[PDB]
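Obj.: predict assembly geometry.
Materials: sequence records (below).
Method: joint structure prediction, all chains together.
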Amino acid sequence: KILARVPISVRWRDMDSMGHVNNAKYISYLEEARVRWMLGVEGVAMTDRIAPVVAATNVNYKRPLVWPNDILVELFVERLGSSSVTIGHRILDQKDEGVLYSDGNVVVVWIDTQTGKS
Amino acid sequence: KILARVPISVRWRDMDSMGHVNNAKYISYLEEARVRWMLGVEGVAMTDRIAPVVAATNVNYKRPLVWPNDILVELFVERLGSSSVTIGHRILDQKDEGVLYSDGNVVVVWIDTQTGKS
Amino acid sequence: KILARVPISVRWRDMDSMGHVNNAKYISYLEEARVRWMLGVEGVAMTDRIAPVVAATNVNYKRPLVWPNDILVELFVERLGSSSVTIGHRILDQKDEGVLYSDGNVVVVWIDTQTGKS
Amino acid sequence: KILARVPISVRWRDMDSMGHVNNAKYISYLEEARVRWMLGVEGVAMTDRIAPVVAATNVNYKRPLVWPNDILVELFVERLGSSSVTIGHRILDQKDEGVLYSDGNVVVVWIDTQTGKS
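Observations (raw structure tokens):
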């Protein structure tokens, strides 16, 4: 199920005028986790042709996140398609993983032209 | 149905290393449209107590957006709840509104403590 | 003297938790003005080889900027070197150009390898 | 001399379409270092009245920074004024501190009304 559990440091600039991390930054935390994940395996990462592109981001905001609380981004496989993968997520507080800031998923497809993974 | 059709200028910095506007920036375009919308009506805008908070952002990425193509963010009421409002959207190209960069919705609730709108 | 006077829309997300546009966003406003400027002249813009790179950004913050006040970015030639150009700037309020949010300059050089413009 | 040496993780989104971390993000790295610094000492941080505001950011870009190379932000006192402090900086590569991405300084003043620190 689990793909990765990536610790991400929150930045002061991540917050907006309302005093909490901006909604848009959540999509960025999920992005960092995905690429830091594909970076693990082995060696240097950069590639072309049959590649992944995000088709949709579905993010639920459960409770406000404030600096300086760093997070833990948990990624797992929610759905496995022939050409797509729906990566579910849980953004938790590093100091108390029982604190859930957000869940939802991101749908990834390998296309950038026409579908392809089968 | 329609709540607003807000023109938004894209910035060069909006793009990422892959050469297209970053997914996270889409949530920001939707945000700007919502507040520029609440700004129209009349007078200066800033308020407290029974207030709106985004519960979820569901954004579908249809085709890549590249600078310097400015957009038009169309917002409409997809669902009207007792305490929430699901604002549907269509991010179109200003020069050709037949070009759809993204659709989906954002769920807004008036709480920030406990639900309230009824 | 004057190179360009570019109107730039401020975004709500531009502000930080302190309630004013973040310092880092100023460098971005200057960036947008520079590229929107090189975009004017004629036709589509994208190029390689002898190209410009920013060597330094020297930005003075005069007074706080708050949404929804859009700005006017005035760019001019402060210094002309053999291989560099120091572009001075004045970020003013669109509704009252007597309101100065920031001045200073950005030093641009055509290198990205070794200096070259002579 | 030294005020702090703060490790900062670079994010993929930090890069722009040109394939290197955007100039504006450097000001943000310097910002994070300053607040993470004021956070060390002791206890929870948030304060009002005689407070610090950035009067100027003078950043020199020495060599391009690319993800996933995390950095080390070194802050030191370049100048001590009666009401201001000019914090010099050196943004280095975490894996090789001999790699200098940027230097320069940030001028901080305690005002937000009228000068005061004497």
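Conclusions so far: The domain at 1-118 of chain C is CATH 3.10.129.10 (Thiol Ester Dehydrase; Chain A).
To do: check interface contacts against the pulldown list.
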